[PDB]
A paper describes a structure:
The motor protein myosin-15 is necessary for the development and maintenance of mechanosensory stereocilia, and mutations in myosin-15 cause hereditary deafness. Unconventional myosin-15 (encoded by the Myo15a gene in mouse and MYO15A in humans) is a plus-end directed molecular motor essential for stereocilia development and maintenance. Here, we present cryo–electron microscopy structures of myosin-15 bound to F-actin, providing a framework for interpreting the impacts of deafness mutations on motor activity and actin nucleation. We propose myosin-15 enhances polymerization by bridging actin protomers, regulating nucleation efficiency by modulating actin’s structural plasticity in a myosin nucleotide state–dependent manner.
To more rigorously probe whether even a minor transition accompanying ADP release occurs, which might only be discernable in more distal regions of the lever arm, we once again implemented a symmetry expansion approach for the wild-type rigor and ADP-state actomyosin-15 complexes, this time recentering the particles on the myosin motor domain to facilitate alignments capturing the distal converter and lever arm regions. This produced reconstructions with substantially improved density in the nucleotide binding pocket and lever arm region. Biochemical analysis demonstrated that the first myosin-15 IQ motif binds the regulatory light chain (RLC) rather than the essential light chain (ELC), as is canonically found in myosin-2 (4, 56), the functional implications of which remain unclear. We next examined the nucleotide binding pockets of these two states, which were well resolved at the secondary structure level by the symmetry expansion and myosin-recentering procedure. Unexpectedly, other than the clear presence of nucleotide density in the ADP state and its absence in the rigor state, we observe no discernable rearrangements in the backbone positioning of the nucleotide binding loops upon ADP release, unlike myosin-1, myosin-5, or myosin-6 (21–23). While the limited resolution in this region of the maps does not rule out more subtle side-chain level repositioning, our data imply that any major rearrangements in myosin-15’s nucleotide binding pocket accompanying ATP hydrolysis must occur concomitant with phosphate release, before strong binding on F-actin. An essentially complete lack of coupling between ADP release and lever arm repositioning strongly suggests that this step of the mechanochemical cycle is unlikely to be meaningfully mechanically gated in myosin-15. Furthermore, our Mg-ADP–bound actomyosin-15 structure reveals minimal rearrangements in the motor domain and lever arm when compared to the rigor state, providing a structural rationale for myosin-15’s high actin-binding affinity in the presence of ADP and suggesting that, unlike other high-duty ratio motors, ADP release is unlikely to be mechanically gated in myosin-15.
Residue numbers in the entry:
A (entry chain B), B (entry chain A), C (entry chain C): 3 to 375
D (entry chain D): 1205 to 1734, 1749 to 1813, 1818 to 1923
E (entry chain E): 22 to 167
The structure:
Amino acid sequence: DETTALVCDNGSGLVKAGFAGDDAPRAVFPSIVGRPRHQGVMVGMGQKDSYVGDEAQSKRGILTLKYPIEHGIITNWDDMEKIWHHTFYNELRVAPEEHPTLLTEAPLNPKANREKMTQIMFETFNVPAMYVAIQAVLSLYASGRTTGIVLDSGDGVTHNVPIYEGYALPHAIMRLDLAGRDLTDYLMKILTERGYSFVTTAEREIVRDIKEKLCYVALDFENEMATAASSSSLEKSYELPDGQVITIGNERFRCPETLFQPSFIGMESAGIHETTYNSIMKCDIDIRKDLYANNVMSGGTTMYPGIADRMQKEITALAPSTMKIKIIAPPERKYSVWIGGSILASLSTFQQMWITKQEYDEAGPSIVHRKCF
Amino acid sequence: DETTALVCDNGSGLVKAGFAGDDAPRAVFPSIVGRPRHQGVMVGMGQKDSYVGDEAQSKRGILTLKYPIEHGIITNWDDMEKIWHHTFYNELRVAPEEHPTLLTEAPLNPKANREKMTQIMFETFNVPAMYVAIQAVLSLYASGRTTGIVLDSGDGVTHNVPIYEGYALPHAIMRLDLAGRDLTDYLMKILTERGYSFVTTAEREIVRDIKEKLCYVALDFENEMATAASSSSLEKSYELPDGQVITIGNERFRCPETLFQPSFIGMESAGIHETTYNSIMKCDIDIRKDLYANNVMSGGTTMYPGIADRMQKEITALAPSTMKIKIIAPPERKYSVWIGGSILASLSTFQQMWITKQEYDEAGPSIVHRKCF
Amino acid sequence: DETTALVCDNGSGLVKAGFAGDDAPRAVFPSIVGRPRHQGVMVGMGQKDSYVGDEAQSKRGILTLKYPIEHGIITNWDDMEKIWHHTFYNELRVAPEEHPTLLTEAPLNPKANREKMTQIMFETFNVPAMYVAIQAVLSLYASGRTTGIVLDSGDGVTHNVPIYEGYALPHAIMRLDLAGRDLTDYLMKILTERGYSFVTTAEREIVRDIKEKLCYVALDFENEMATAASSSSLEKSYELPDGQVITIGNERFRCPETLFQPSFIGMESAGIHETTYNSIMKCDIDIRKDLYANNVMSGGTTMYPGIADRMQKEITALAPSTMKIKIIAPPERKYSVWIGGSILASLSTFQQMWITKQEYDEAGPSIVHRKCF
Amino acid sequence: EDGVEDMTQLEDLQETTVLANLKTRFERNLIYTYIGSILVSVNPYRMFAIYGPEQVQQYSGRALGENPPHLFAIANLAFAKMLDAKQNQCVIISGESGSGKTEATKLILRCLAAMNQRRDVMQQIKILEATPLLEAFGNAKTVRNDNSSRFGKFVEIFLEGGVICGAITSQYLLEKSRIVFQAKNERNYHIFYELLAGLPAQLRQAFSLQEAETYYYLNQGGNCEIAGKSDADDFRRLLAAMEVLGFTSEDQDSIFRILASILHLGNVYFEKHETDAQEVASVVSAREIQAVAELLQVSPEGLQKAITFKVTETIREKIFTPLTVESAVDARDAIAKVLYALLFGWLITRVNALVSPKQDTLSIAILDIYGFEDLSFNSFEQLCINYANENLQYLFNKIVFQEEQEEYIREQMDWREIAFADNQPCINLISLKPYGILRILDDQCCFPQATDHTFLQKCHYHHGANPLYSKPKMPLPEFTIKHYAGKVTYQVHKFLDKNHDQVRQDVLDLFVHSRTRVVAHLFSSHAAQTYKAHTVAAKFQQSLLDLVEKMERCNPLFVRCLKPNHKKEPGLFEPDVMMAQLRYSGVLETVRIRKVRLPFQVFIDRYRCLVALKLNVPADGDMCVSLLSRLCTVTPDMYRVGISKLFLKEHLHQLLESMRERVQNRAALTLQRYLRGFFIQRHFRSLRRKIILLQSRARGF
Amino acid sequence: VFAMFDQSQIQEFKEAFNMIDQNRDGFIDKEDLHDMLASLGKNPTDEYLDAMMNEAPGPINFTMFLTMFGEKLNGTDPEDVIRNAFACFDEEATGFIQEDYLRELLTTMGDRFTDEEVDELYREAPIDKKGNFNYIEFTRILKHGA
Ligand SMILES: Nc1ncnc2c1ncn2[C@@H]1O[C@H](COP(=O)(O)OP(=O)(O)O)[C@@H](O)[C@H]1O
Ligand SMILES: Nc1ncnc2c1ncn2[C@@H]1O[C@H](COP(=O)(O)OP(=O)(O)O)[C@@H](O)[C@H]1O
Ligand SMILES: Nc1ncnc2c1ncn2[C@@H]1O[C@H](COP(=O)(O)OP(=O)(O)O)[C@@H](O)[C@H]1O
Ligand SMILES: [Mg+2]
């Protein structure tokens, strides 16, 4: 009885799912639940009271966009259940009671989150078996490596996990709540300097698209600020969905710099380079050599052009001058975690590490804290 | 049926083995058993739960180093059995049931140690014959001499054995528990004066490497202390495995001086020179002349540059002013005992002094106390 | 000319000072230097750019808390100089050039620390005489004893010092870098299991207050874990400074257990009971009897309710079954070291063991290594 | 003449006795032996035109008890069984390469065609012409044979109401690892060398094929001229048959183009060239890939991006990934293997379509299958071959146990309770789902930072306690599996490079849009006919499962073939070679199935002296079981003696023989002493009883 | 044992013994026989008296005397045991034992006998032309008497 196990990377801002053994996610759509707010006047078109991610993307102008997952933790459980039901039935058209499912999670997430996730996916969808895997180990699986620090930076969380030859160092795991959504909010707040006002949720997503299509990270900040406010070479234009053209100057690269300077939002934490260096310096010396030599990336918010060069420069400035820093920036930073999950779920030696229905029924939901990580 | 007998000098910190008749040990590796301590996250790389000496050397950062032999006596028997099995099969690739084996031992070791060693090497590996020889007589064999006092100072024990024309004087054998491992511990405790902290086992072995590569013994202590704290000529730099440079001053030569001044560790015993002189003065006068004239060295921890000159100066200050003291310091202080064992095991007149399997089976393990020494 | 000598126990997280001859420290305040981080908008209130411990405690929300002393060693010298100047002038209102001062130190601290401490306290404040005393001997002074092992566990260091009738055994001094600050960090990292996020420095100190007011040490760990995850009897509630109520379960006693199980943070060392037993077994047998019979405590981080009973149980399980273990837990574990320093500084026979200004000027700062300990 | 057709009736069954019987029959010019259901054939190296059409009427099924054991009896047996049980069945031809399997197939096809008096009229049904072509496509030189079948040839002969219809041919277990890799002193498939030897000039100037001796896919063996018996005349006759099959010249030209493209792809190298942040790959010479593109009707940039870049394509974007050198080599090897497999499938499909018979008709099966292999050093191909032979040996053991059970029931009802131990544990050790060896290998294929040492260590860990597994003592890169034919030691050298048969969808999409029609059609058909996996082992297991399902759809009955000394000596052989071939075939397991089998008349005759049986002519009703108890006090454990006579078990049999020889020794001692007593008593009469009386007369007067 | 004795042949035993073992160590000499037979006197001749004895059995003693008398032939060679031993090599009721059969049985198994012993049997064994020796008459004559 051959049954491919589903791999459902339900990230913080985008849901990436598919079957195990493929090379790319079958379905990719934002994790948004939309509800209309105005009053319906045409008799008959007042029945669809909830639009899942892509449909709510198509109809931004007459409804409100709410993200069920805020900064990693699942806030609204009913919306997340709706998203899971949609991505199981209306998107893959595969009954979830005949296929095992794999789910991902941030490292330092609360425990009630896992307990409720297991309870929902065992009681509602009646999945035969499920598993919860940290995203960094899946990123390392997908990168085809066994050593190095994973810098997984989605839009809800940014965490480092040092691994050496398969043995994780759980006391060096660092997690930051600064991610892509906060970059989008800073871009919204910094675009007002030129007069463009974005307040609604649809305008917030327009700003998100602007960030994806225009923003980049510079090697040096003072030099690039001088260049921007010394000419018009860095200015680029964007077209809003009503044909209105906007122009962006030094705001192009001052949006993603807050990753290295989180004092712009007012956070007391340090940049991603500093957290990576501190996580290395929480590990053993023999570990430290290979952690220096094998930095790896993942997550969407690390796709800014020029991120690798600057973080290499910063680590080299921080690390001792005699060591070799080599930062891996594969062109699949997006959904590398899903590729790793698909590789992991296709292993025949993984068949014994599921969470069978009998186990959950006999020992209760607490076994998700025992069989994971 | 020509069968070369194995010679396995299982010292206190390093295992040096090979075939009889060679001129150097075939295999040299530390006697360490390593076990991982963290949690494995990659499915599949959680099977190798014990690393023998060299493999555990390569992977210090994710496992704990335990020495089965502490201060000469064999503490953990299972780890020592694992080391023997490794050095027989995975290192020499020679079946131990077809070759006789020779083993070394400290002079004043307990008797249960010998009984259990014989029991293990007869019941597990089914060796046709084995023998246990004191290390000092093998050192004298390797030095090509028949008189003099052997100062065998490994990293677990430091003992003197006076021999005159092949007749040992068992009432003049002195044994000290101060050896190289205690020097390494003192170096760890004395490096904190400059701020370097070494606590783990891997850091302990880094300190051991520092001791091997930098430490020396001075002729005069007060003069060299004044010179060290009067200039920077004695300062040398070392590079840790993460590119971090450390600087060592007067700690360079104050680590191996505790051999001559064991009050630094708090021991009530006297230095190696004093024990050698007292061992001589426990012998007959006609013996004393040749013991004065023929001091010899062995063991790793006597390889410090300047040990011979200082111990010559100290013996000359102790001995009567009219006698000639000549200390032999051959450049093979390391594994001189193995060279002597190889010479001894290759003699055709030695064939009758083995411990055959029939003898052990008929008379029990107690014959190891009868046919040895 | 009667001049009481100041006693300034500048610990790792709290400064406890006063005059000699009193029974309690005159001034107690955290050793924190705070600096504002936001931008000032009101003209005039932008001059106070540095707040010393208590003022920085009052204004946590608009500034960053930095501890000058990290794990015993003094990292930032200017901040420590500011703290000393504050505790001399703005807190005791006593000119330091007319009173001798006594300072404490960890046993195995670096030497440049002492040299710079003496240089600062002789050149800046122009103190007539100063002295540096180990904290364990002062704890024994305050306990009114002359034998036993002192377990001084501040928030920066945890060290044992065996003393028998006034003669210290310097080769049995053990020092661990696991202390109260690492317990606070573990509590911060373990509170995320329930969803409470503490990242800033002010939130770190809120967690410290939680640890002080709620944490305890249990006799048995498995039994108490079962009891905690079998009922709600151990759950207690705490009120954050904004009226938000938090609930703590099994995290209440799993924070201070890492003292006995330092593998939770990943350290390779052993618990405080194991280090105490090993320090005893590094001493002579006649010493060992009285060291068994006279264990004593000090330091703030030993004030957890139930620490004495568990460490008594562990020592009794480790020590031979026929000996009597009696652990002294006086109700002044906090600032017992200061009481001992006040007793020591008030002795008229101590007048000849100061470090006079003429001595330092003629022989240089190196005499602090000669007249101390 | 010396029949011994059924060796079950002998006193005991040993491999020595079986070897002696086969030697005696071979010296009697007898090849086939009728061991009940099973048949055994030996290659004679002797051209035996046994009879002609008369043998069908001479060796039919009416007198199987008196007819000589012959290969052609199964021809009538098949019809007799299908006309009675109304169920078609299958016949397999198994044996080592060179054991006359093709000759046996030709003989059985001739006999089936000659039994209906119609083949002379409908000989135009073009059946066996392509056998040499499928041979050139499916055979290759091995270190022990210059003609070895490396694919599971399957020919289905269709029948409807006694009328012989057309035939359908198929391949099951072709080894795709041979195309790109080959051991020492062996070579690739014969047709590459045949094409390179029979290549006309116009292909030499047009196609760049002047490096026939330096292609990487071919020079790996180290010596390609050992097969010098083959020549360009084989190519000429192959082309003659190829044209006979109705193929136009365009099809042959396209086939040669694909083969030349594969050979050119063999000669492609990569360089560890630096790039943005790593060192990944770079094509050394672009002229070769350009030439590949010219003769394949496809873009060259497509091949560059399909063998250099990895394509991870989602709905909204398509991302290109640089590849490592090993990954590029694996992709190239996968492309070559899939091209060769598609060519073979296309040719088989066309051949079947040319002579396609009616549907929903009766069918008899002929299966040409591998032989058990045990070389000096063993690799992945030998492991797969051994696994397939293990499955077939399991089926054969099931058949033998079924025959034993039906015989036992035919004697008495109550011996169906006798049990039997199969080789299922070996099959589980090889390919059980959770922790099979092939499953571990498949997991190691995709696992990050994997090598041969890690795979070997994991196999050692998971199978330490398995009795069939045998960890080597020395730290050697080997392991030993206990097959039914004995211990086989494999080498884990280069397993990970023999399984990376990963073909991304972009390659298939590129080859669909090719300008030539044949390649586009083949790839479109492959995409249309296509759950699966991406390793050679997984595809081999899937094909083996399909073959097992096809076999279990019908009734299995087959025949084994053995080989004399491989020096092509007619009528001369070594008994050790016979022992080796008997062990490899699997007929030795029949002795283990016998476990007891001894007669009753032996007890009737030569077991009476013990109690000195007073009576004569004992019947079966004589006190027999208790008799032994009264002579050896052995509990009744013989199955049953009676008339149904297969009861005496081996160890009790040897005990009885030892007792018999001891009794004979004591009786001989008694006879010796009795003769001595008689001689002395003669001596007594002589010296007094016939002398003193004479002396009385002498003194008398 | 003498407890059960076949007195028919005890007279033969005593005669043979008193002719072979006499009031001496055990040696049997021409003197005893010659005296007991013709001590009166016979003139010497050499017609057939140049070779008398060549196959002496061995030494004799009174202890060996009694042991041999008890063991060797007293009530031995039972008829049923004779039939059993002779038929152990035979399946036919009539006891046809092929002469060659016994030839290999004696010269191939156990301690080897010589063809001279086989001839000794044949020189007294009644055997049919085909070589199938029988033993019913053998037992009859052996048990009947002299
Ligand atoms: N090409 C890009 N450039 C910059 N930012 C991107 C790009 N693609 C995605 N992002 C950012 O990454 C965030 C989430 O991406 P991803 O990591 O794929 O999902 P998740 O965070 O759920 O794992 C989005 O909020 C988006 O702003
Ligand atoms: N070149 C060297 N200089 C100083 N110390 C050394 C040197 N080589 C080895 N040692 C010390 O000798 C100790 C053991 O060496 P050796 O005597 O060869 O092994 P064993 O003590 O087992 O016989 C080690 O702990 C090491 O510290
Ligand atoms: N009542 C208490 N219960 C638990 N922990 C305490 C208590 N009081 C103080 N501590 C801990 O002791 C640490 C320092 O206390 P103390 O030893 O008095 O200062 P220092 O370490 O500078 O000598 C603080 O970090 C605090 O966490
Ligand atoms: Mg992500």
